[PDB]
Design a protein around this ligand. Structure first.
Ligand SMILES: CC(C)n1ccc(C(=O)NCc2ccc(F)cc2)n1
Length: 149
């Protein structure tokens, strides 16, 4: 699969993260990210996808070594960590045909796993609108503890 790049943007307090909500298959909440183009450097793809989805340019803030990367079903997703962005920043996507809404979420309230259905003796996981963000939440909380305390 083609690698994806984007950002985990936090506010000044470090307790909120910015998620975006797409449509249809991308109908839940997730970190802003997208597929890398031919010859495009990972930091440039992250800034482009982030600016396409939020209107906010992270180029002057990206730190090369500060990211979380996960391999999910043989697709690599790397989100550069971008703290300290004021909560009153005006985010607007470029294409409202792709992004429904953009919101800050409390990190501590976000789930870091989906729930089973052991109540119902049924296998699998219950739907959760934060499905795409979930895999990054525990690695983020651990990264913030290490790098900030
Ligand atoms: C399996 C399905 C649920 N899926 C695939 C990708 C996403 C996702 O990333 N959702 C949030 C999102 C990010 C970028 C964007 F441009 C629009 C929406 N969700």
């Amino acid at each position: 699969g083609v690698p994806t790049y984007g950002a985990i943007i936090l506010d000044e307090t470090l307790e909120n993260v910015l998620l975006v909500q797409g449509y249809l298959a991308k109908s839940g909440w997730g970190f802003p990210k997208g597929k890398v183009n031919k010859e495009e450097a990972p930091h440039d793809c992250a800034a482009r996808e982030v600016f396409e989805e939020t209107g906010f340019d992270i180029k002057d803030y990206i730190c090369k070594d500060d990211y979380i990367e996960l391999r999910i079903n043989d697709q690599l997703a790397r989100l550069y960590i971008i703290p300290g962005i004021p909560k009153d920043t005006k985010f607007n996507p470029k294409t409202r045909r792709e992004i429904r809404n953009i919101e800050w979420f409390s990190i501590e309230k976000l789930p870091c796993h989906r729930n089973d259905m052991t109540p119902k003796s049924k296998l699998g996981l219950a739907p959760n609108k934060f499905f795409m963000a979930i895999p990054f939440i525990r690695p983020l909380r651990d990264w913030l503890s290490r790098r900030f305390g």
